[PDB]
Amino acid sequence: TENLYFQSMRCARSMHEFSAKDIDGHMVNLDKYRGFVCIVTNVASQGGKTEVNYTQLVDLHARYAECGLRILAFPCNQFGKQEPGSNEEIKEFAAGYNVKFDMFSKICVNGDDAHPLWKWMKIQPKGKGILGNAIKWNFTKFLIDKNGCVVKRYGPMEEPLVIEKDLPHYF
Ligand SMILES: [Cl-]
């Protein structure tokens, strides 16, 4: 079972209570996203849906950054080992898609070594999965409101443009 080891954290109210290393290795306090609507997603470079996901995320960011949309991308190698490269290589991969949103260092999203933000997101009322809460594949997406609460989860079968219709409610 996936366990928080600071059991307090089952009572965390917001993504803004968490921190993560950016793709350059620097700690980022996620409270910087207060007042912004965020899409948080796990990414891979060698996935079957890598091209559509990066392309559409870059498009949403281009079209809605000025409305308050931010995107946090977390590389993860847990799905067919489809993100095997170094953070430096992943950074250059994203640059080829002209990514202007925020890239993070590679993490686990499932299991005992999952980043705490990911452990927390999947037990939120609106972050729950269909059969259990595990992240099922690359490019699961969580929509986070301006107060840092999880408001919707989109599975790997949902391309990022599907999210577009839901954004105006949270801006
Ligand atoms: Cl994929």
Measured CA to CA, the distance from residue 163 to residue 144 in angstroms comes to: 12
State the pairing for strand pair 141-144/150-154: antiparallel
Residue pair 18/38 in contact (Cβ under 8 Å)? The answer is no
Residue in this structure with the two tokens 């620097």, named with its chain if needed: 26
Residue pair 94/103 in contact (Cβ under 8 Å)? The answer is yes
- Which residues, including other chains, have CB under 8 Å from residue 4's CB and lie 6 or more apart? 10, 116, 119, 120
Domain count, the chain: 1
Measured CA to CA, the distance from residue 112 to residue 122 in angstroms comes to: 14
Q: Which two tokens stand for residue 39?
A: 């899409």
Measured CA to CA, the distance from residue 3 to residue 66 in angstroms comes to: 37
Using the mean position of ligand 1's atoms as its centre, give its distance from the Cα of residue 81 in Å: 11
Residue pair 37/71 in contact (Cβ under 8 Å)? The answer is no
Measured CA to CA, the distance from residue 157 to residue 159 in angstroms comes to: 6
Residue type, 97: Y
Using the mean position of ligand 1's atoms as its centre, give its distance from the Cα of residue 158 in Å: 11
Give me the domain span that covers residue 32.
1-171
Residue pair 139/49 in contact (Cβ under 8 Å)? The answer is yes
Using the mean position of ligand 1's atoms as its centre, give its distance from the Cα of residue 43 in Å: 8
Measured CA to CA, the distance from residue 88 to residue 76 in angstroms comes to: 14
Using the mean position of ligand 1's atoms as its centre, give its distance from the Cα of residue 8 in Å: 33
Using the mean position of ligand 1's atoms as its centre, give its distance from the Cα of residue 160 in Å: 12
Residue pair 26/133 in contact (Cβ under 8 Å)? The answer is no
Using the mean position of ligand 1's atoms as its centre, give its distance from the Cα of residue 52 in Å: 9
Residue in this structure with the two tokens 């946090």, named with its chain if needed: 72
CATH of the domain at 85: 3.40.30.10
Measured CA to CA, the distance from residue 28 to residue 108 in angstroms comes to: 17
How far is C-alpha 37 from the geometric centre of its chain's CA atoms? 12
- HEC profile for the chain? CCCCCCHHHHHCCCHHHCEEEECCCCEEEHHHHCCCEEEEEEECCCCCCHHHHHHHHHHHHHHHHHHCEEEEEEECCCCCCCCCCCHHHHHHHHHHCCCCCEEECCCECCCCCECHHHHHHCCCHHHCCCCCCCCCCCCCEEEECCCCCEEEEECCCCCHHHHHHHHHHHC
Using the mean position of ligand 1's atoms as its centre, give its distance from the Cα of residue 11 in Å: 32
Using the mean position of ligand 1's atoms as its centre, give its distance from the Cα of residue 106 in Å: 16
Sort 132 into a burial class: Cβ within 10 Å, 0-12 / 13-18 / 19+: exposed
